[PDB]
Ligand binder design. Sequence first.
Ligand code: HEM
Ligand SMILES: Cc1cccc(C(=O)O)c1
Ligand SMILES: [Cl-]
Length: 393
Amino acid sequence: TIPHLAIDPFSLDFFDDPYPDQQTLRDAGPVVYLDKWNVYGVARYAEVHAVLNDPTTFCSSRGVGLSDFKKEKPWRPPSLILEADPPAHTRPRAVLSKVLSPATMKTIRDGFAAAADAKVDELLQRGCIDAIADLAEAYPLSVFPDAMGLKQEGREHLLPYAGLVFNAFGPPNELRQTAIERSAPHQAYVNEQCQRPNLAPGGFGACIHAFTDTGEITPDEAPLLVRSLLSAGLDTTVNGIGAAVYCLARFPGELQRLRSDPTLARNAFEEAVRFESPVQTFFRTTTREVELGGAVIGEGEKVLMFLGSANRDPRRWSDPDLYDITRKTSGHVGFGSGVHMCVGQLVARLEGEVMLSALARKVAAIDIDGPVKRRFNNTLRGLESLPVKLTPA
Ligand code: HEM
Ligand SMILES: Cc1cccc(C(=O)O)c1
Ligand SMILES: [Cl-]
């Protein structure tokens, strides 16, 4: 009834060019079985969206990586939000929502925008830069650790820790096992910065700890909620902004449209998140036997959702393989969908918007002028190196 495929969606060959294999996964059927890892897969928009929006049947508390927490110990204490189901999910989610709220965005927008403008000005003085290290990494590193309230010392641990976290959702391949081997100093740093005295007043971390007296969370929950922001809040935006610059570099017609109307910046970033899908995949675990797309899945089965594939499914999107900054992007699943839909999406969009605004106002051309190198991670899609020449407007 269900087609069986040998495609390994966590192989370097797949990461290097996932699009043919994603079409093979979509076209094989609404539900596939991946013999390499003994999991079900859904790669079409309809089934990915259905799975995301039924958290009772497709739960997160048995892990959103390949490992089933009912069968194996999690490599770190479970996240109180990502790896929780309702009702335990609900109040921690509400706290992070209020921490990363519209009012918070209003307090930080001017500073985030000034830092974006300053970075682009600095890069234009160099002309030839690496849009990963020098822009996609450098700009989030210049705003997000400060917005968290982190001290200066030890920030070099943040990107390695996040790469470890996203590799650890994967199967036990070499990427995952090497990440865990090297993890001890990054975990130690991160767990220490989650404690209330190490988070500067007014930042996101202090605000989480200040929410521990309302009856929503207790003091002993606040460090792991800070940990969620230090896990998910930096490396995602690095790959989101990197995706947007890579798109603008490959589609000069769209850079020209963005220059002519910088108010398209926010949608140009949203389209980059759909088009590249920095977070490629997440899993759920079935809590019962369930019929999905005419297939019957037993209880306690892992289901791999291909978010990037759903965002390119021609059953849902017209010309899905085109980067179009005026596309109606509403409904893409690059931030997820439903009760776990990215609680940091306003921070991500703020960063992406103000960076793309700075590019739109200051840069006339973005030309790849060196070898492009991909970065391999079991969950994140993005580049290691993106040499570009920036021509000033
Ligand atoms: C381009 C940037 C980003 C992308 C593509 C992205 C993607 C996602 C996705 C797909 C999910 C859903 C997970 C699931 O359904 O299991 C999610 C959830 C989440 N994200 Fe984001 N994210 C981004 C930025 C951020 C930022 C900046 C933060 C924090 C400041 C953050 C914190 C979180 C958290 C804490 C969750 C868990 C929410 C929940 O389980 O209720 N993310 N993200
Ligand atoms: C979306 C996401 C990614 C990585 C870690 C977390 C977390 O809650 O720790 C969330
Ligand atoms: Cl940790």
